[PDB]
Design a protein around this ligand. Structure first.
Ligand code: CL
Ligand code: CL
Ligand code: CL
Length: 268
């Protein structure tokens, strides 16, 4: 980090050489084979319950690797695969997208990739005092993944996309007045999901992450994805590294071995 270690999606050291957790057995993302998913009736014992509210204290940043929308942990998630009574607070939203519409998502479903995937990152406030303390620990982090296609405009995300112009380079941030994560959830009647255990898809790549992947995608407009496609991996004026084009895009980690993992479905 302070020793000059930059990581990215183009040229650079293999992540496992610098981030030991990346060498684990249970990494993310993965290909999800829908036919291999096992229905678990117990996921319905307490219905997965995203209790999200509007955020009026929210910062958007370009960290050179993704766009982060940092929220307030007021929105909360519980139920489904999560331990009974535990409250997972929503900390932020991160984005992964492609340079062309045929790729961009981190996870694939039956080997199909999507133009974008967004991650709603939650931490367990029932067990831990902060998200930093929860990383890498059992039941510490739960991430909801949404696949995103290209189509009609996403109104809720316009609050973000219309300020991407202001954070084109690494290290730039922008406060926005209002963001509602409810708009990132499928309609209440379209919330089939799969669950598996894995890792962060970015360094440090720690395991202990419960992944909840919704079956139904969001849509953003072509203009919206084009804004994302202008973003840069470095500060303005930086000398590009050999092999790199300075463009932040196709910012997905390759899919990882399933190993012996059981993928569960909350639906038949
Ligand atoms: Cl790499
Ligand atoms: Cl992420
Ligand atoms: Cl410009």
């Amino acid at each position: 980090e302070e020793e000059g270690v930059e990581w990215g999606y183009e040229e650079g050291v293999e992540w496992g050489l610098v981030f030991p957790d990346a060498n684990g057995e249970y990494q993310s993302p993965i290909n999800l084979n829908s036919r291999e998913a096992r229905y678990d009736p117990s996921l319905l014992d307490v219905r997965l319950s995203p209790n999200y509210v509007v955020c009026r204290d929210c910062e958007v940043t370009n960290d050179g690797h993704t766009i982060q929308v940092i929220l307030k942990s007021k929105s909360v998630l519980s139920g489904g695969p999560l331990p009974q009574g535990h409250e997972f607070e929503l900390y932020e939203v991160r984005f992964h997208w492609g340079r062309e519409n045929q790729r961009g998502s981190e996870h694939t479903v039956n080997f199909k990739a999507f133009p974008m995937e967004l991650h709603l990152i939650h931490w367990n406030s029932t067990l831990f005092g902060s998200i930093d303390e929860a990383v890498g620990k059992p039941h510490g982090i739960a991430i909801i993944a949404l696949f995103v296609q290209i189509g009609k405009e996403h109104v809720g995300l316009k609050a973000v996309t219309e300020i991407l112009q202001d954070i084109q380079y690494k290290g730039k941030s922008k406060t926005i007045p209002c963001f509602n994560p409810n708009t990132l959830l499928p309609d209440p009647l379209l919330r089939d999901y799969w669950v598996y255990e894995g890792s962060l898809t970015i360094p440090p790549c720690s395991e202990g992450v419960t992944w909840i992947l919704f079956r139904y995608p969001l849509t953003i407009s072509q203009l919206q994805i084009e804004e994302f496609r202008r973003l840069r991996t470095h500060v303005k004026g930086a000398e590009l590294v050999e092999g790199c084009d300075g463009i932040l895009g196709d910012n997905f980690r390759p899919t990882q071995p399933l190993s012996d993992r059981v993928i569960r479905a909350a639906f038949q």
